[PDB]
Amino acid sequence: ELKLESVVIVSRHGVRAPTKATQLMQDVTPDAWPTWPVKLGWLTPRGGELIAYLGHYQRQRLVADGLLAKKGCPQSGQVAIIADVDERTRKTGEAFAAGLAPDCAITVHTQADTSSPDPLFNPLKTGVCQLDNANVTDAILSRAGGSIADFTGHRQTAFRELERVLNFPQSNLCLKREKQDESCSLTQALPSELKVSADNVSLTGAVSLASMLTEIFLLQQAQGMPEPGWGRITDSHQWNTLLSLHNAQFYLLQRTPEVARSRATPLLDLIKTALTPHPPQKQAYGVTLPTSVLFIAGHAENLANLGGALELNWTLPGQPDNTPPGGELVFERWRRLSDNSQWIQVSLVFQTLQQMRDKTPLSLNTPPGEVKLTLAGCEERNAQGMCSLAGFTQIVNEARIPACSL
């Protein structure tokens, strides 16, 4: 009924070491954090291998869909790869290429200067545009339930789960509060406030600490470390409860449209240029678009920003992190044969946490998880839930912030 014409994959980088080692991380547990085999924030070898499995799976699926050849290397830019300048994203691009097309030496493009941020992955970071402080503050606080106190008050079960995994009551932070007649709870020992600036939004205290620590436990599990969370995380309900704190911070700071639309605008422009039929032309990064397959190696925020800007909602069965390492927002252009009309499908492809833990080789018979998505604002949908090309174009033009374009 339908023929696949084009695919754009926006991928988070693979498993990485923690990006920071702070004094507060030491003070909230009596135990020693496991050390990692690469520098802070770098991709691990295992993370690269997990990405290559997704590349291998995507080759098999795209061959089955008739888009790539079963044997040989894709020719003349049929496949293009763009990565953010960070080590972890560059090496994710290389790992994906190695799985998709081994020995084909597909180039991993970055911006010219790899020592400075690339605004494609967040235009606020180079000051292309700025957030509206009052609008962002009100929008985030409303999505939090009206205040950060309301937000943390409704999540005490998850904070107590994190405290148990940390053995928080025996930590230096708690032992000093016991000596000062103040009771030991993460949220009250580390009050959380929303900080909004022209170029960033963040949360302080327990909310951001919890978001980072629960991601570290997940990374430990995916890395195959023997005892993530000191062996105190023993079932799936516990994993889901812990990562709810991480996903909740992303819901506030990255999915909120008042942030997401600006942060996602350059990626929206690149996705639309890649998916829209037009005479091929070398554009950004020296990549010729449109082409058959474009893989973009970025960050968790990019997945969440695109989700918030485009009203794409999901949770990932079997994967506690809704923006997991190697997770892929996959945009596809399909041609309907009955009338040769053009349609856009979006899905979230991801390894389950168990597939990461077991280093499961992926294939058509053992596929990654996949969640089919719908653009909530699309008014022209086909029977398969895809948006018409014109409908998707209108949604993108409405969502994007022109001042944030490159």
Residue numbers in the entry: 5 to 410
Give the published text:
Notably, KM was 5-fold lower than wild type for the proton donor-less AppA-HAT variant and the MINPP-like AppA-HAE double mutant. The low turnover numbers (kcat) for these hydrolysis-compromised variants (only ~0.1% of that seen for the wild-type enzyme) suggests that breakdown of the phosphohistidine intermediate is rate limiting. Of the remaining variants, AppA-HAE showed a marginally increased production of InsP5 [1/3-OH] (22% of the total InsP5), while AppA-HET proved to be more catalytically flexible producing almost equal amounts of InsP5 [1/3-OH] and InsP5 [4/6-OH]. At residue position 305, the T305E substitution found in the AppA-HDE and -HAE variants results in sidechain χ1 angles of 46° and 65°, respectively, for the glutamate residue. The residue therefore adopts the g− conformation rather than the preferred g+ conformation for glutamate observed in α-helical environments, which is seen in bacterial MINPPs for which crystal structures are available. The g+ rotamer is required for the carboxyl group of this residue to approach the phosphomonoester bridging oxygen in the specificity pocket A to allow it to function as a proton donor in catalysis. Thus, in the AppA-HAE and -HDE variants the E305 sidechain points away from the substrate and towards the active site cavity. The inability of E305 to participate in catalysis is reflected in the similarity of the kinetic parameters for AppA-HAE to those of the proton donor-less AppA-HAT variant and low turnover number for hydrolysis of phytate. AppA-HDE has slightly enlarged pockets A and B due to the loss of the side-chain methyl group of T305, whereas the double mutant AppA-HAE has larger pockets A and B with an overall change in polarity. For both variants, pocket F decreases in size and its polarity increases by virtue of introduction of the larger sidechain of and carboxyl group of glutamate.
